[PDB]
Amino acid sequence: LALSLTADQMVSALLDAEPPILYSEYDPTRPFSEASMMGLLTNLADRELVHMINWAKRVPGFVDLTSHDQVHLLECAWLEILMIGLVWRSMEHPGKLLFAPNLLLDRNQGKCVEGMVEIFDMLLATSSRFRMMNLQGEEFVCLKSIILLNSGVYTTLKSLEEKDHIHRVLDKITDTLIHLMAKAGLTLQQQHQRLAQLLLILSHIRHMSNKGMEHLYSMKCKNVVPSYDLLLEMLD
Amino acid sequence: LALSLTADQMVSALLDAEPPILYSEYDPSMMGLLTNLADRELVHMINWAKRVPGFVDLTSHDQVHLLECAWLEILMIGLVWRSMEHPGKLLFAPNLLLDRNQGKCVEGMVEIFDMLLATSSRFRMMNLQGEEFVCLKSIILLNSGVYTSTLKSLEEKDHIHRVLDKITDTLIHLMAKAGLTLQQQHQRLAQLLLILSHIRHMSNKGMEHLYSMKCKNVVPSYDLLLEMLD
Ligand SMILES: Cc1c(-c2ccc(O)cc2)n(Cc2ccc(OCCN3CCCCCC3)cc2)c2ccc(O)cc12
Ligand SMILES: Cc1c(-c2ccc(O)cc2)n(Cc2ccc(OCCN3CCCCCC3)cc2)c2ccc(O)cc12
């Protein structure tokens, strides 16, 4: 299946696959220490991962890949997905990050953790960028799907078949995005322009994830990347 | 200024801005040759930048910032372009074609090499054209350090996004004249722009790889950049 859908079926399939908004532990001794805050954020991210995989498996064409490739895609994209999710729910809160409804953090508190405020500022500018573009929910949900499939599709006859499949679904998601823009009343020109502006944003988000990884590795954190087994286990 | 140009005038201007292909100063250390080569490519990269439609409409500090963020990506998409027609190899210079096996001589590099070779295959499979390539490089210059507060800064970011809108039209136009449908047009546009994300990934991996060894400084200096822009 997965290539039969209309654009409208694609949006709906993606909208219902959407993960829930999770909460931080309701037990914080606010104000924070650098360790307490990294503890709450880490705990949150760990719980978001399980819903992320479940979401991934409901993304059109994702379960058609081999389990090994599914793991590979998730290995590359997991932090990017976290980040575009974070910036999305932070849109209506300028100068703040909404990790959880009970964990809205301003810029000054990011500076509690060494080097995080640098990572923090990139995230805010991106949220602001989404706000100025008036990014819509269907567009976001599409952009997130693109990140999942694209971040690792740069890695046999089987192997080329899996990649052309991935590129087939991505062209469909591209079709879906254009369709959404057409019914909004944008011209052929505004359609190509807006599509471009959205994808150029993914480039920066890739940069943010890259910086984020170094920051996490810089806090000498315990076991940053999810491991092949944990990803494989959660996928079954 | 540049917001007035047609797609074909945009392409023509960018094709004429293209830097020369430089040579490795070889013999008849490998990091020595590559470092030396990259250093000489930088001056022409700046000359190229100043001739990209709308780059000189910006302030010098803003030009420096863009070049500060994009320089390694530009080097890399340049390398991948001239390596396209040489499978399993990357052409740093006409007298310096290297396989993965020779990249594996230098520590931690074989990973970056594989990423770069992978980009070449992708360009090759897409039949990426010189005109498209030349458009993609300009986008890298303008887009990589745009996300970064006076009224002037706001005008700067609006100009950059207007010029970026222009190259999108330019890219779409090229695809139309090649005979692709409207649907094939936005698909290829998407495919090209999504590749830029990977190049950003390579660029960051590249920096970490460069810091893992020595340099005088890895990032070019603000003054030198401001100096080179003259
Ligand atoms: C973007 C983001 C981060 C993050 C990003 C960059 C940083 O420098 C710091 C935090 N954080 C906090 C954070 C991000 C990543 C973390 O990795 C910790 C370990 N877990 C990864 C999921 C589990 C198996 C692997 C290890 C731990 C905490 C988020 C939490 C929720 C969320 O929606 C978004 C984020
Ligand atoms: C892709 C690529 C590399 C490269 C270097 C290190 C890696 O780990 C992977 C690829 N290199 C070699 C190289 C690239 C960048 C380098 O940066 C450090 C040295 N001088 C760098 C530039 C600003 C002025 C000061 C620093 C040093 C070596 C290329 C050279 C030319 C070229 O067209 C492409 C490349």
Numbering used by the authors:
A (entry chain C): 306 to 460, 465 to 545
B (entry chain A): 306 to 333, 341 to 460, 464 to 545
What's the publication's text?
Estrogen receptor alpha (ERα) plays critical roles in the etiology, treatment and prevention of the majority of breast cancers. Selective estrogen receptor modulators (SERMs) like tamoxifen are antagonistic in the breast and agonistic in the bone and endometrium. SERDs competitively bind to the ERα LBD and destabilize helix 12 (H12), leading to proteosomal degradation, while SERMs push the helix into the AF2 cleft to block coregulator binding. Here, we explore whether bazedoxifene (BZA), a potent antiestrogen that retains some SERM properties, shows activity against breast cancer cells that express ESR1 somatic mutants.
X-ray crystallography was used to reveal the structural details of BZA’s antiestrogen properties. LBD (10 mg/mL) and incubated with 1 mM BZA overnight at 4°C. LBD-BZA was crystallized using vapor diffusion by hanging drop in 33% PEG 3,350, 100 mM Tris pH 6.6, and 250 mM MgCl2. Specifically, the C3 methyl on the indole ring of BZA appears to shift the core of the molecule away from M386, L391 and L428 and towards H12. Interestingly, the distal phenol on BZA appears to form a hydrogen bond with improved binding geometry to H524 compared to the distal phenol of RAL. The core differences for BZA broadcast down the linker arm to alter its vector towards H12 where the azepan ring now pushes against V534 and P535. The alterations to V534 and P535 propagate to H12 which appears displaced out of the AF-2 cleft into a less stable orientation. This less stable H12 antagonist conformation likely explains the SERM/SERD properties of BZA, wherein it allows H12 to adopt an antagonist conformation (like a SERM) that is somewhat destabilized, although not as destabilized as when FULV is bound.
